[PDB]
CSV table of C-alpha atoms in Angstrom, one decimal:
chain,number,residue,atom,x,y,z
T,1,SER,CA,134.7,36.3,56.8
T,2,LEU,CA,135.5,32.8,55.4
T,3,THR,CA,138.7,33.6,53.4
T,4,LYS,CA,139.3,35.9,56.4
T,5,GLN,CA,139.0,33.0,58.8
T,6,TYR,CA,141.3,31.2,56.4
T,7,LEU,CA,143.8,34.1,56.7
T,8,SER,CA,143.6,33.7,60.5
T,9,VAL,CA,143.9,29.9,60.6
T,10,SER,CA,146.7,29.9,58.1
T,11,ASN,CA,148.6,32.4,60.2
T,12,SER,CA,148.0,30.5,63.4
T,13,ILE,CA,149.0,27.2,61.7
T,14,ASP,CA,152.2,28.8,60.5
T,15,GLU,CA,153.0,30.0,64.0
T,16,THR,CA,152.5,26.4,65.2
T,17,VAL,CA,154.7,24.9,62.5
T,18,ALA,CA,157.5,27.3,63.3
T,19,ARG,CA,157.2,26.3,67.0
T,20,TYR,CA,157.4,22.6,66.3
T,21,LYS,CA,160.4,23.0,64.0
T,22,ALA,CA,162.2,25.2,66.5
T,23,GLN,CA,161.8,22.7,69.2
T,24,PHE,CA,163.2,20.0,67.0
T,25,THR,CA,166.2,22.2,66.1
T,26,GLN,CA,167.2,22.8,69.7
T,27,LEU,CA,166.7,19.1,70.5
T,28,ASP,CA,169.0,18.2,67.7
T,29,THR,CA,171.7,20.6,68.9
T,30,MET,CA,171.6,18.8,72.3
T,31,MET,CA,172.0,15.6,70.3
T,32,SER,CA,175.1,17.0,68.6
T,33,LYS,CA,176.8,17.7,72.0
T,34,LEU,CA,176.1,14.4,73.5
T,35,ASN,CA,177.0,12.4,70.4
T,36,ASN,CA,180.4,14.1,70.2
T,37,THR,CA,181.2,13.5,73.9
T,38,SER,CA,180.2,9.9,73.9
T,39,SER,CA,182.1,9.3,70.6
T,40,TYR,CA,185.4,10.4,72.0
T,41,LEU,CA,184.7,8.5,75.2
T,42,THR,CA,184.3,5.4,73.1
T,43,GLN,CA,187.6,5.8,71.2
T,44,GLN,CA,189.3,6.4,74.5
T,45,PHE,CA,187.9,3.1,75.9
T,46,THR,CA,188.9,1.2,72.8
T,47,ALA,CA,192.5,2.4,72.9
T,48,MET,CA,193.0,2.0,76.6
T,49,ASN,CA,191.6,-1.6,76.3
T,50,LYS,CA,193.9,-2.3,73.4
T,51,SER,CA,196.6,-1.4,75.9
R,1,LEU,CA,111.4,20.4,74.3
R,2,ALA,CA,111.4,23.4,72.0
R,3,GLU,CA,108.0,24.8,71.2
R,4,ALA,CA,106.6,26.0,67.8
R,5,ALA,CA,106.4,29.6,66.7
R,6,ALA,CA,103.0,31.4,66.4
R,7,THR,CA,104.4,34.8,65.4
R,8,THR,CA,107.2,36.3,63.4
R,9,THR,CA,110.3,37.1,65.6
R,10,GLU,CA,111.7,40.7,65.8
R,11,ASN,CA,115.3,41.9,66.0
R,12,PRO,CA,116.7,38.4,65.0
R,13,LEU,CA,120.1,40.0,64.2
R,14,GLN,CA,120.3,41.2,67.8
R,15,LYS,CA,120.2,37.6,68.8
R,16,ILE,CA,122.3,36.0,66.0
R,17,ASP,CA,125.1,38.5,66.7
R,18,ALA,CA,125.0,37.7,70.4
R,19,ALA,CA,125.3,34.0,69.6
R,20,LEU,CA,128.2,34.8,67.3
R,21,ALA,CA,129.8,36.7,70.1
R,22,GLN,CA,129.5,33.8,72.4
R,23,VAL,CA,131.1,31.5,69.8
R,24,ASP,CA,133.9,33.9,69.1
R,25,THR,CA,134.7,34.2,72.8
R,26,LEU,CA,134.8,30.4,73.2
R,27,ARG,CA,137.0,30.0,70.2
R,28,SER,CA,139.3,32.7,71.5
R,29,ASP,CA,139.6,30.8,74.8
R,30,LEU,CA,140.3,27.6,73.0
R,31,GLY,CA,143.0,29.1,70.9
R,32,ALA,CA,144.5,30.8,73.9
R,33,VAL,CA,144.9,27.7,76.0
R,34,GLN,CA,147.0,26.1,73.3
R,35,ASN,CA,149.7,28.8,73.7
R,36,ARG,CA,149.9,28.0,77.4
R,37,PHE,CA,150.2,24.3,76.5
R,38,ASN,CA,153.1,25.0,74.2
R,39,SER,CA,154.9,27.2,76.7
R,40,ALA,CA,154.5,24.5,79.3
R,41,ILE,CA,155.9,21.9,76.9
R,42,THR,CA,159.0,24.0,76.1
R,43,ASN,CA,159.6,24.7,79.8
R,44,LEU,CA,159.2,21.1,80.6
R,45,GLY,CA,161.7,20.1,78.0
R,46,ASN,CA,164.3,22.5,79.4
R,47,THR,CA,163.6,21.3,82.9
R,48,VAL,CA,164.0,17.7,81.9
R,49,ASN,CA,167.4,18.4,80.3
R,50,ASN,CA,168.6,20.3,83.3
């Protein structure tokens, strides 16, 4: 009953932790994309201004 | 206000278990709503990006 409730709450908590971490992972992938794009945009500006 | 007891009460388990059932049902509902909250959050993140 009590250690049982612990089993249940541990399980539920674990589900929640996986959820949070997964959200963070996807968000960071989006970050990767945008960072790369903006970085090459920046180099292009620097060169074409050096022009 | 609650009154005093003049006699011993019968079938107390048939009331305690009913109270426990009520508590279990409420806890189930509370746990459930969090899943909807999380699904909504994920969907909102996707929609915001789009």
